[PDB]
Amino acid sequence: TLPVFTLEQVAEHHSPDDCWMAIHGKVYDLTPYVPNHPGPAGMMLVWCGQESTEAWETKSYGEPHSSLAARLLQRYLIGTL
Numbered sequence: 792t793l794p795v796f797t798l799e800q801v802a803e804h805h806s807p808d809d810c811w812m813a814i815h816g817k818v819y820d821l822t823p824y825v826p827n828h829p830g831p832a833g834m835m836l837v838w839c840g841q842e843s844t845e846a847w848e849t850k851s852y853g854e855p856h857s858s859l860a861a862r863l864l865q866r867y868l869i870g871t872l
């Protein structure tokens with residue numbers, strides 16, 4: 792069954808070399824994905840350790856992530872919030 796985390800635990804993984812996020816009530820360990828993120832360098836890094844649903848939904852300027860990107864995000868799932 793999926794592990795359950797709190798936002799406080801997610802916040803301990805807040806750096807480029809140890810980056811977890813909470814998106815839509817789910818927790819993801821995105822550390823391996825960090826260097827592969829497309830777009831302007833370092834946009835995902837500001838959200839390591841955070842609840843990041845709005846940034847996920849809008850890319851911070853008003854475009855959603857694609858269905859392809861949503862499949863890629865799900866691979867890094869580690870639990871629920």
Ligand code: HEM
Binds near residue numbers: 834847857
């Ligand atoms: C949560 C904070 C995130 C922010 C603010 C963010 C922002 C962005 C931006 C600015 C771009 C380029 C512009 C554009 O494609 O319209 C982009 C593209 C992309 N991002 Fe993110 N991203 C985030 C997280 C993620 C995560 C967690 C993944 C997957 C593991 C991901 C996967 C991708 C992919 C695959 C693209 C290429 C375009 C697409 O398929 O939608 N991003 N992102």
